[PDB]
Structure formats: C-alpha cells, structure tokens
Design a protein around this ligand. Structure first.
Ligand code: MET
Length: 523
C-alpha cells in the first residue's frame, strides 16, 4: 500500500554535546529520506533528543543547573549542529514535549490493560550511562573516576551499580515465540545480517521480564510519572522508544514546529517506521523490547532496523564534523563518512584518507568528468548534442548507465549506502575510461559527427550518476545539474532514472572564470 515513507534516527541523550556519532546516525537517516524524496515518494524523516532519566539529571547536577534548563540548552546545541550539517529532517522531537508524554501514558495504559504490566522487583546490575539492565554474565571487573575497583559493563565499559527496587515489570518473557516468528518471517527486518543472527540467538536463549518503572527518588524525579502511581517513573527507554510513535502522530507546520497530536496514527500514514537507523550499541532495545511493546499494544511492527558499526554515545583524539566540513567541504565529508565504512568500525578516518578520497574519487573521477563534458574546448556549442549511430562500445557504456538505477535502488533499500556509492562510481570510472578511449578533444577537429555521439552519452552518464548521488551530495549535485543545464523537473522522479530523459538541444548552464567543483588538496 501507498504510505508516507517513515525513517528515523535514534533520539540522543543530552548529557553531553553533539559529536560525530550523532551526526553519523542522523546523516544516514537523512540520506535514506533524501533518496525516497528523489524517487518521488512522500517522506517523514525524524530525529531528536532523549531528555529524561538518571544520566541526564546527574549531568545537569554536575553543571549545577536545573534539568529543565540543561536539556533545553543542549537540545538547542543538537538543533544547531544539524542545521549546520545541512540535513533535511522533517521534525526534531524532544521527550520533554507534552504531546510525547501523553503518548507514553496511552501506550503504558494499553500495555497494562492487555495484562502485560505487573508490579514486581528488579534485583540486579544496571548501567546508568547506557540506561541498561545487565545480567551477571554481562559485567566484569574494572575502575571508576577514582581508579578504585568497581564493576563495569562488558558491552560498553561503563560503571555498573546494583539496583534493588520494587518496579512495574513488563512481561517480555511471554513474547519470545512471537519475536522469533517475526524475525524468521521477515528475514530482512534487521540489517546487517550478522546482527540479525545475534538478536535471534539472544532471544532463543530466553527472555527475562523487564523493569519498565523506577522509584522516583532514584531518577531525581526527572521522568514521566506512571499513570495511576506517582511514586513510579516510566523507564527512560520505554519513554524514548515511544518517540517514534509520537512522531508518527504530530502534524508539523512550515517552520517545523509541532501543532497537533492526532488520536489515530493511521491519519498521518507514517507508522510504523519503514527504517529505524541505530548504532549497534542500542540493538537490543529496538529489535527486542520495542517490537514486544508493539505486539502487546496490537500496533504494527517496523519494516527494517539498520544498525551501523559505530558505538554512538581529553584523551587526545578529537573529531569535530563541523570543523572538518569547513576544511574539506560539507558534501565531501558526508561522502567520506558514507563511503569509507559499511557495517564495521574498521574504516580509516584520517586526514590522509579523507584527502585521498576527495582527490581521487570526487575530484579526479567525478569532477574531472563534469568539466570535460561541459568544457568549451570539447562542447563547443554549449549544449546536449543529438547522438549519431551507436557502436558496440557505445552500447556497452549505455547498458551500464541503464542498469545503474535498478542496482543502486536495491542497495539504497537494503539499506546499504556504501554499496550504492560504489555502484555509481563503478559507472563513473567506466565513463572516464570511455572518454579516454574516444579522446573527444581530438574529435572536435577530426570527426564532429562522432563527437556528438560520444558527448551525448558522456553527459547522460554524468546526469544519471549525479541523480543517484544527489542524496549523498545534495549541494554539489545541484551545482552539477546547473552546469549541465538540466531543467528542475528532471532532477527528481523515477521517470528521470531512464536513459535519455533530457533532450538534445538542451542548453548548458553559464560558466565562471575559474570555477571548480572539488578542489584537490595538498598531500
Ligand atoms: C529510542 S533511541 C534512544 C537512544 C539513546 N538515547 C542513546 O543515546 O543511546
């Protein structure tokens, strides 16, 4: 069925300033959203801040400022960061928002009515920094700020404390069979695949019930009250995960402010998420807890959870994304982050490798090709020529260009943005090779008829590759299209994935004295 394509980032803890992890997660979310908008679909892309809980309230206390003031200020820092990064997110949600709290209370009440919440106790380990319950098998020995013997989390390395409280408990154990059914019936619902296998193994072993409330004193009263019991607060993660539901129900105006909360999610056609973008650090919450809550409430499950390789959320290793983007370019940094790494940590993020990709891929492969086909020396009439008859070599390149949208489409839908980029650049390399073989600079004098054909194919290859790279290079793609003289109507829509969508006779855009797309930088 036709619906609004709904893509989300995690909502980030506001204990600290925005950093590369947050920017990376929201970048992926943004790229996916952009691709679906270029495809001509309706899109709602969501990001925001996770503002309640012990961790935030303790950070507020450290800075000697109220939780209200602290969260509002740090949220403002996140908004500013994402504006500076030139994202195109449709809404920024904050869990302190009154409409979100109403949704949390609805969902809580639904779970309780279904018989899935009971009053019990949690006695066990807890990482405040991850807001995560841990079993004894997931802890080990380590050290704290004092350098004194303490327990730490195996998953994250943060300090764990023993908790013994009477707590509202969600009957997670009862959802094991249904979760396993879901994973097996939808074998692309978690990506990448090895992370799907991890989740399945964990659920097969068995699920304990889950504490979904805490004593109010423990959280410094900085959380959502349990409906019908003011002494208890809603677990920060049930609160947090519900943001996706709240977002799916907010009507938003032209300026991006929330103006209304609808009763029925179906009214806005967003829920459930088509893609939840997350870091590997929060996989269990999204692939186990979240769907169990939705199953309890009788709500539809998300289509895909994609978990990337970075562990999101003084030592002398600073990476400021705004600083690096001011140095190397915003689109270039975005390209680098999405190209350098797939679902690993193992990528190299040095200035050396950044420069190597800028120079070799963006400047030498893409930019060079754009200048060649728009150059006055080669394109003497400053237009899209009408092609003459095609050779076999012409047809081999044309075939690559025609196959590219379908290939790139599949990669974007996985989603696997690294492979989408690689596929496009494989075609760009082939076009370059073709240009080198045809030597159009010699044809200008020798064989003008032949040049028409070569020039046309080259222009069309640059257009199609650029269209498919426009989610990755949103600003530079616009520059490229302006140079090519591609009318606005042809810059989006699946109709324009087709070879030959821009007619011969189309005039190129004006030139500038010494304009460069991507300036190469010192080795
Ligand atoms: C429902 S997404 C919550 C993510 C969490 N606040 C984090 O920063 O890891």
């Amino acid at each position: 069925v036709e619906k609004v394509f709904f893509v989300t980032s995690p909502i980030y803890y506001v204990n600290a300033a925005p950093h590369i992890g947050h920017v990376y997660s929201t970048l992926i979310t943004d790229v996916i959203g952009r691709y679906h908008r270029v495809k001509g679909e309706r899109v709602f892309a969501l990001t925001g801040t996770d503002e309640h809980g012990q961790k935030v309230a303790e950070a507020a206390k450290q800075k000697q400022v109220s939780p209200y003031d602290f969260t509002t200020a740090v949220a403002g820092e996140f908004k500013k960061c994402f504006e500076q990064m030139d994202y195109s997110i449709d809404y920024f949600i904050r869990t302190t928002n009154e409409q979100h709290k109403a949704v949390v209370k609805e969902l809580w009440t639904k779970l309780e009515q279904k018989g899935d919440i009971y009053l019990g106790r949690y006695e066990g380990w807890y990482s405040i920094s991850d807001e995560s319950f841990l079993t004894p098998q997931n802890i080990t020995d380590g050290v704290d700020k004092d350098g004194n013997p303490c327990k730490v989390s195996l998953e994250s390395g943060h300090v764990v404390t023993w908790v013994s409280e009477e707590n509202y408990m969600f009957r997670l154990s009862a959802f094991r069979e249904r979760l396993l059914e879901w994973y097996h019936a939808n074998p692309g619902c978690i990506v990448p695949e090895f992370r799907r296998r991890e989740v399945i193994r964990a659920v097969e072993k068995g699920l304990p019930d889950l504490s979904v409330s805490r004593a109010r004193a423990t959280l410094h009263n900085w959380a959502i009250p349990v409906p019908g019991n003011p002494d208890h607060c809603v677990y920060v993660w049930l609160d947090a995960l519900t943001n996706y539901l709240t977002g799916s129900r907010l009507r938003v105006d032209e300026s991006g402010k929330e103006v209304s909360l609808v009763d029925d999610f179906n009214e806005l056609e967003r829920f459930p998420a088509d893609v939840h973008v997350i870091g590997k650090d929060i996989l269990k919450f999204h692939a186990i807890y979240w769907p169990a809550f939705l199953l309890s409430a009788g709500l539809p499950l998300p289509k895909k959870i994609v978990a990337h390789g970075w562990w999101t959320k003084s030592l002398g290793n600073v990476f400021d994304p705004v600083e690096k983007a001011e140095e190397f370019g915003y689109d270039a940094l975005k390209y680098f982050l999405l190209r350098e790494s797939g679902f690993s940590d193992d990528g190299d993020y040095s200035d050396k490798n950044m420069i190597a990709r800028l120079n070799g891929e963006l400047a030498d492969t893409l930019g060079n090709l754009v200048m060649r086909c728009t150059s006055a020396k080669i394109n003497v009439n400053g237009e899209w020529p009408s092609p003459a008859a095609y050779t076999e070599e012409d047809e081999s390149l044309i075939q690559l260009i025609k196959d590219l949208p379908g290939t790139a489409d599949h990669y974007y839908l996985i989603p696997d943005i690294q492979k989408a980029i690689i596929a496009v650049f494989d075609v760009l390399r082939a076009i370059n090779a073709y240009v080198t073989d045809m030597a159009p600079w010699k044809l200008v004098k020798t064989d003008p008829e032949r040049l028409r054909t070569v020039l046309y194919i080259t222009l069309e290859g640059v257009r199609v590759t650029t269209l498919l790279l426009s989610p990755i290079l949103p600003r530079k793609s616009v520059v490229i299209f302006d140079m090519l003289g591609v009318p606005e109507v042809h810059r989006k829509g699946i109709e324009n994935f087709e070879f030959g969508a821009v007619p011969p006779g189309t005039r190129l855009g004006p030139a500038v004295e010494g304009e460069v797309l991507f300036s190469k930088r010192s080795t």
